[PDB]
Amino acid sequence: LTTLDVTKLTPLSHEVISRQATINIGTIGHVAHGKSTVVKAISGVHTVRFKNELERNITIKLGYANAKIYKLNFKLVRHVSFVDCPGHDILMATMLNGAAVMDAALLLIAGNESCPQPQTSEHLAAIEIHILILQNKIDLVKESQAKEQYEQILAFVQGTVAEGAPIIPLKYNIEVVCEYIVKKIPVPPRDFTSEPRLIVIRSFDVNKPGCEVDDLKGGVAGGSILKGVLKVGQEIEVRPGIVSKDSEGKLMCKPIFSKIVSLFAEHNDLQYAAPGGLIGVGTKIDPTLCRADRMVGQVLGAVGALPEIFTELEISYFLLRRLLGVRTEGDKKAAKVQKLSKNEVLMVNIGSLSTGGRVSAVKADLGKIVLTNPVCTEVGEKIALSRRVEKHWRLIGWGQIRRGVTIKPT
Amino acid sequence: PPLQAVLVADSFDRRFFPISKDQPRVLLPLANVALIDYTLEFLTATGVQETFVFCCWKAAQIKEHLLKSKWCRPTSLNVVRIITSELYRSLGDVLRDVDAKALVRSDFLLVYGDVISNINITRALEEHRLRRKLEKNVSVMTMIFKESSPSHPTRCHEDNVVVAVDSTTNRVLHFQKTQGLRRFAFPLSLFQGSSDGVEVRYDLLDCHISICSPQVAQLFTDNFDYQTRDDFVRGLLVNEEILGNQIHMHVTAKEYGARVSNLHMYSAVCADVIRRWVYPLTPEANFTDSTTQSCTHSRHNIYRGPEVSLGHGSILEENVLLGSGTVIGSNCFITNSVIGPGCHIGDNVVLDQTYLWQGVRVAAGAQIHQSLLCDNAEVKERVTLKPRSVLTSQVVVGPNITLPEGSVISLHPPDAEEDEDDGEFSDIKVFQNEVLGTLQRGKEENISCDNLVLEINSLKYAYNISLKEVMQVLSHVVLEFPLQQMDSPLDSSRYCALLLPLLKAWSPVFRNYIKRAADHLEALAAIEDFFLEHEALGISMAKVLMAFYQLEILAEETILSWFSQRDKGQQLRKNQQLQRFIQWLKEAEE
Known part of the structure; x- marks a missing residue:
């Protein structure tokens, strides 16, 4: 069992006293429902189970999986948060939207062939960024795996121009990959002295059906901490809050402040919570205000975060010509991102806030996207812009927020 | 459990133009009764306890229209x-907005504000609740269609709907429209996913009364x-x-259900209402309790209001409705038509398949076929109207002016056809092409x-x-982009001027592509091949050689190794300009 406490003044990223969330290790490869099995073989199958509900956003939300990689009755020093998002374009839009996201990219390569999914994974890893290649096609012939490793090293030699210098060709291979990740991936610099900002990715309800009148747990929200340290008892600040359009016009966003009753991770976490993991906070919020993924997209600040709820953001429209690494055998005008037409939906992924927005107006250098829900990240943050190509949200461009229209009710 | 409903009182398509610029489409009367009253009567006869009306455009007019109705009274069961x-x-x-407000609870209806129906959907909601209790809230939407032949004038070509469903469990597998499609394409995974039975259906008119679960929101x-x-x-x-969320379906064969989005849907649904196809909802029953809309049903579906004052020789043969106070002159001929309240009709007139609203005034001798006249209209004598003519909100048509088939006249000039008055007269190659297109886009958009x-x-x-x-392909694309600025100049000046700013602006991409010494040798070989392919600008071939050393693309040692390495390329590099450039580079290096 852990021995953490509420006595801390200046913690570190590689502190062994916490042993809950130290670093994050993203994974974007050619999995096709194969990376979750690799994360379960590396960490645990039924290890991450705190509060489940109906799967609302499967491809839009990213799943974090903690792994306490020990060494030597073993000793644990640092833990790695395996971020396995469904769809490599969602992880690429979240990493290429600012700083401190997908610090240790893991290229889940396959020793079967050199198909275009690995090319799209290499393009997403180059657009995101420390790479970590790992061949998952186990149990092959010796000469066949040698030729496949030669082909993969020839593909990664073209990858070595940008970032291509990892080397890894069933439990012993996973242990060797864990040792190489513990020896190669350095501790990234995280800002602990700032205010805690918990971007919610998946909210849950801890109150069961037909519970007692006094035994009522409300508002067990879940997300990721961008920077800072969150302690139990500090009044969190939901910056989006309750958005109500009852005034028959522009909707007002009332920020609901809630006292943090507990910080409950996948294990029994302590009062202090650091960044780099799926931080779960059970605050003093109502069950109707925080339903199943209802309070998602809300920046749960701590000290009154400066980011106000913007309704329409005018950013610099900079769309790519073709899709990053997506090129099939036909290519009959499929990899061609069109211009930003009027009244077109776009999935702007500002950091972890993936909000939809209609293209209201644009004149050749800047699109004024009117967002559906209120978003509050910054005034000049790097905002991405995605577009559903064929039943899948794929990234189309990036930009910087040039102007906005803020609103803050009380 | 209660029964909630969502009513979209503003269909956001630009179809009823410029009729919608006066009054919204859900407030237009079929037979002196607006469409939102028909939809609210259908919802109240269904068994809905609470509705949620949503209005965007001209919403205050909708609010003041429905506030004096039967459904906002305190005696109304349907709030x-x-x-x-x-x-x-x-x-x-x-x-x-419904999901953000959390209004509904479970199994709520979703309907537009211009839906004409008389279906009791308790069997469909029984089937939907049984499927939700069986499959543990897996099935979400239960769409409702009506059986109809595809030749019927109700279903037009703009919204003819072909589905592919199961006949055993009534789940929807495919859905499409026929908006300009002669051959329809269907997928194949629906047959492999359900090997027990499958059917295609073109006999389904869409009623847009899709009852839903809150998983839709x-x-x-x-x-x-x-x-x-x-x-x-x-x-x-x-x-x-x-x-996953498999949508199920219900088919109605003994009750009516449709909506309106054209003049064709309006005319067909109005002709079905006058011919009592949406019984019990009939105009003589007066489901909206108003004294200005009650009628009496005569033979041949002739509905007569109060104080009409017919004249001698006026004959009504089939499907005629007369509102409150509409005076009718002598020797008239009215058939298949709806006349509003308080109108004025002249003498010796014919009116077939026409829709006259309130306040209109028709003079003598007017012949009107298959048209639509909106509120407070007027028309003089010696006029004859053609089919599919729209008159909108007090447009006056002068004498001796016959309108063509396509005719929409309103007070707004650009939305209608005209505006009237008292007078009517006024492998490696594809990668090289993609790199060239990317370079052209970066040069055009200043990337x-x-x-x-x-x-x-x-x-x-x-x-x-x-x-x-890739380095050789990029060098060939950079050589071809400077050669594309001049069509057939065959000179070194234009090629050198096109290659100097291109190498000056794209110097970082050339430094990132060609980085090693072998990459510099490959770039020198590609430059030699481009000078061999562009020998008419070969006098500029030395000018690029002084440029690649200037923009730090090709180093001086790599340039000396390329000049020392020899053929036709050695004879081209042994010219006076290349030797002078090599001497200038050796003098400037040290």
């Missing part, structure tokens, strides 16, 4: 909730790209193992060096070419 906002502009905006909150209903079903059917390097890396990862091959 309404008037919700208006100037922000929403689509049905998915309405449903995500959940998926509309998630998917922002889903703008309307068929967008939602076309995104739900093509993605089955993610967000930065980082985005250009990212696009070049994405093209190199997609084409899976070698590093030296």
Whole structure:
């Protein structure tokens, strides 16, 4: 069992006293429902189970999986948060939207062939960024795996121009990959002295059906901490809050402040919570205000975060010509991102806030996207812009927020 | 459990123009009764206890129209909730507003504000509740269709709907329209996913009375790209193992159900209402309790209001409705038509398949076929109207002016056809082409060096070419882009001027592509091959050799090794200009 406490003044990223969330290790490869099995073989199958509900956003939300990689009755020093998002374009839009996201990219390569999914994974890893290649096609012939490793090293030699210098060709291979990740991936610099900002990715309800009148747990929200340290008892600040359009016009966003009753991770976490993991906070919020993924997209600040709820953001429209690494055998005008037409939906992924927005107006250098829900990240943050190509949200461009229209009710 | 309903009182398509610029489409009367009153009567006869009306455009007029109705009285069993906002502009905006407000609980109806129906859907909601209790809330939407032949004038060509469903369990597998399609394409995974039975259906007229679960509002909150209903079903059917949510279907054969979006749908639904196809909802029954709309039903579906004052010789043969106070002259001939309240008709007139609203004034000798006259209209004598003519909100038509077939006249000039008055008269090659297109787009849109390097890396990862091959392809594209500025000049000056600013602006991409010494030797070999292919500008071939050393692309040692390495290329490099450039480079180096 852990021995953490509420006595801390200046913690570190590689502190062994916490042993809950130290670093994050993203994974974007050619999995096709194969990376979750690799994360379960590396960490645990039924290890991450705190509060489940109906799967609302499967491809839009990213799943974090903690792994306490020990060494030597073993000793644990640092833990790695395996971020396995469904769809490599969602992880690429979240990493290429600012700083401190997908610090240790893991290229889940396959020793079967050199198909275009690995090319799209290499393009997403180059657009995101420390790479970590790992061949998952186990149990092959010796000469066949040698030729496949030669082909993969020839593909990664073209990858070595940008970032291509990892080397890894069933439990012993996973242990060797864990040792190489513990020896190669350095501790990234995280800002602990700032205010805690918990971007919610998946909210849950801890109150069961037909519970007692006094035994009522409300508002067990879940997300990721961008920077800072969150302690139990500090009044969190939901910056989006309750958005109500009852005034028959522009909707007002009332920020609901809630006292943090507990910080409950996948294990029994302590009062202090650091960044780099799926931080779960059970605050003093109502069950109707925080339903199943209802309070998602809300920046749960701590000290009154400066980011106000913007309704329409005018950013610099900079769309790519073709899709990053997506090129099939036909290519009959499929990899061609069109211009930003009027009244077109776009999935702007500002950091972890993936909000939809209609293209209201644009004149050749800047699109004024009117967002559906209120978003509050910054005034000049790097905002991405995605577009559903064929039943899948794929990234189309990036930009910087040039102007906005803020609103803050009380 | 109670029965909630969502009513979209603003269909966001630009079809009833410029009729909608006067009064919204849900307030237009079929037979002296607006469409929202028909929809509220259908909802009250269904068994709905609470509705949620949503109004975007001209919403205050809708509010003052329905506030004096039967459904906002305190004696009404069906309570309404008037919700208006100037922000929403689509049905998915309405449903995500419902999800943000959390109004419904479970198994709520979703309907437009211009739906004419008399279906009791208790069997369909029994089947939907049984499927939700059986499959543990897996089935979400239960669409409702009516059996109809495809030749019927109700279903027009703009919204003829072909589905592919199961006949055993009534689940929807495919959904599409026939908006300009002679051959219809169907997928194949529906047969492999259900090997027990499958059927295609073109006999289904869409009523848009899709009763839903609140997971519809959940998926509309998630998917922002889903703008309307068929967008939602076309995104739900093509993605089955993610967000499963199998839509089921109900088919009605003994009750009526439709909506309006054309003049054709308006005319067909009005002719079905006058011919009592939507019984019990008939105009002589007066389901909206108003003394200005009650009628008496004569033979041959002739509805007569109070104080009409018919004249001698006026004959009504089939499907005629006369409102309150509409005076009719002598020797008239009215058939298949709806006449509003308080109208004035002249003498010796014919009126077939026509829709006269309130306040109009028809003079003598006028012949009107298959048209629509809106409120407070007027027409003089010696006029004859053609089929599919629209007169809108007090347009006066002068004498001796016959309108053509396509005719829409209103007070707004650009939305209608005219405006009237008292007078009517006024492998490696594809990668090279992609790199050339990316370079042309970066030169046109003035893209930065980082985005250009990212696009070049994405093209190199997609084409899976070698590093030296990609460097040679980039050098050939940079040589061809400077040669494309001049069509047939065959001179060194224009090629050198096109190659100097291109190498000056794209120097970072050339430094990122050609980095090693072998890459510099490959770039020198590609420059020699480009000078051999562009020998008419070969006097500029030394000018690029002084440029690559200036922009730090090719080093001085690499240039000396390329000049020392020899053939036709050695004879081209042994010229006076290349030797002078090599001497200048050796003097400037040290």
